[PDB]
Design a protein around this ligand. Sequence first.
Ligand code: HEM
Ligand code: HEM
Ligand code: HEM
Ligand code: HEM
Lengths: 141, 141, 146, 146
Amino acid sequence: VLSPADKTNVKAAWGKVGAHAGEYGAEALERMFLSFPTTKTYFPHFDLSHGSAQVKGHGKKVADALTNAVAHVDDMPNALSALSDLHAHKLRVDPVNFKLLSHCLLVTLAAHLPAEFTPAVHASLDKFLASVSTVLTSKYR
Amino acid sequence: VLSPADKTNVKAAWGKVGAHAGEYGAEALERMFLSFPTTKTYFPHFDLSHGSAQVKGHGKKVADALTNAVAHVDDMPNALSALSDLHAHKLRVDPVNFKLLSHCLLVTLAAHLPAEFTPAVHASLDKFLASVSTVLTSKYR
Amino acid sequence: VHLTPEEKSAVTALWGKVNVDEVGGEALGRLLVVYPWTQRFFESFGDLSTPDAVMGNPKVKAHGKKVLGAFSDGLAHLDNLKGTFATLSELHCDKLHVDPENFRLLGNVLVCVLAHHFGKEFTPPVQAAYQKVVAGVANALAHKYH
Amino acid sequence: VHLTPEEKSAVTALWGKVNVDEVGGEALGRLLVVYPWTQRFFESFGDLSTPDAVMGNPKVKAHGKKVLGAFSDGLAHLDNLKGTFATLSELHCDKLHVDPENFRLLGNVLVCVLAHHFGKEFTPPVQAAYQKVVAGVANALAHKYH
Ligand code: HEM
Ligand code: HEM
Ligand code: HEM
Ligand code: HEM
């Protein structure tokens, strides 16, 4: 669903991010690969190193995807089905993995946006990534 | 999503059930309450007994809901949001619990429809209950 | 484990049967057909396209008998389930990097496979019993992640 | 547990700080505000309507300090985490019937609470460390279900 409030809470929280958005993707990824190593069996072709121009690169991508999503909030399905197909059908991504990432994403946001990571947003925000994952895994349902 | 095939695989599997549908709900419930006792902290007011005219009763209900769903497959959201609100907002149902039930439901179907519980259906069917849960929990997203 | 002795019988007796040769496959198979993502771990088994390709797949039925084998074992070693699966733990964990979750899935489909084959006799209680083993096994495997 | 000694420090040192009195609440609170269904276990705490009602709720902050307390403990008893939480296990399991899942959630929000309060210093590695404790604690609690 995502109420007219979460969609405001998300948008704001994202807006208050900026160019850093990309840099935050890469960081969220690192957190995940270090925190939940199980998830690494998806990026063998990646040098999950600490400064990997690869991890840093994927971030820029994951970021713009979450943004593409924040922009078409009232309609992410027809937006990410591009990825849904990829993530579902092609890459065969274990769904749980969309939780773990979606977590590090929030832990990351939390560690950079101290002023606005209010519980209100936090919750609002979770739902968002929740709705994103949901869609990214909707091509499983 | 649910392809034009799963929707055929579901419908058939359900059709091949009949009046028993209700009786299958009640049984699925019993399986769940016995298998995953954690789930019982939702029906204190129920006599989770083996013949409970309550468990047997709820079945009839859960059943008709899954049917209401099989009938409005190309549109369960606007059908179950009735329940979504209840299950989400009012009853505060732990989402995992929609997995466990959705499991016993399939274990139950499996133990009564041996001829048609082909892996094809099984999978098709899972997705269905998956899509049901999803919606029933969509009022969480 | 635990299993009321009343629960062992149900497990012990209803298991004595089991088309051991077929069931292992029915599980592993339905697994890779119901929860596709698991196919990521068996690309090296041949065409897993449609389910008819998955089921009749020799490579599968062959792995299934062992998966079931590993249960037979765990079933007669509930006393110490963790350890028995030590190797396997290492193999599915620090070596194959499988998600503890996928272990709840294989045991869940298996339960369905059982729910299937035996049908009516697979009473809710008998299930509640296997549902305990399936987990108790999903955990031993899980072991090597902490 | 395990924790490279390199990992203990990160956990040990970055934890020495912690507004112990506040953080416990920040977790339990955000919990009942982010994952509402958990409120089912604290209706007996007063208005949990809006989050502003949840956060400033004395009953909460009071429970939080203990939740955090139970960690402090588990943190200095990683050697034997299961047992230390024996009572608590019984209390959240065979007595409160909470889903093992909700234990991964409280530790996850907590991690966020930490991710918050310390901000920049909560390096991915430091997280990966807590992420280990949080789990190792979610499991001990879980214990009494098998
Ligand atoms: C938070 C949700 C996520 C978003 C928005 C996201 C977004 C993206 C985007 C846009 C790409 C680049 C696609 C391209 O360049 O064509 C991608 C690829 C991919 N994603 Fe994600 N992703 C998410 C979660 C995940 C998770 C949870 C995993 C792994 C556990 C994962 C695994 C992959 C893999 C392996 C690739 C392909 C890697 C490669 O070959 O470069 N993603 N994702
Ligand atoms: C497979 C999906 C499910 C369907 C289709 C379903 C359907 C229903 C229906 C139609 C009712 C009766 C509503 C009424 O008479 O107004 C109901 C009530 C309820 N459901 Fe479910 N349900 C599902 C899953 C669950 C789960 C997983 C739980 C518990 C773990 C649960 C907990 C409840 C409770 C406690 C009630 C209210 C009980 C009462 O006061 O009588 N349901 N459900
Ligand atoms: C209760 C859970 C499970 C049991 C009982 C089980 C048991 C086993 C056993 C005994 C083997 C045979 C190894 C040998 O002796 O050579 C094996 C191997 C393997 N298992 Fe499982 N397994 C479980 C779940 C799964 C799941 C969920 C996956 C992940 C999708 C999986 C992936 C593998 C793979 C890839 C091998 C390949 C062995 C090889 O490389 O030849 N298993 N498992
Ligand atoms: C890492 C996980 C958790 C820890 C560390 C934890 C720890 C504790 C501790 C130590 C107490 C105080 C008991 C006392 O000394 O009187 C307690 C009580 C309780 N916990 Fe948690 N808990 C955890 C997660 C949760 C979750 C997820 C729920 C479920 C929603 C929950 C529900 C309860 C309830 C209802 C009590 C009430 C005690 C009373 O009746 O007075 N806890 N917990």
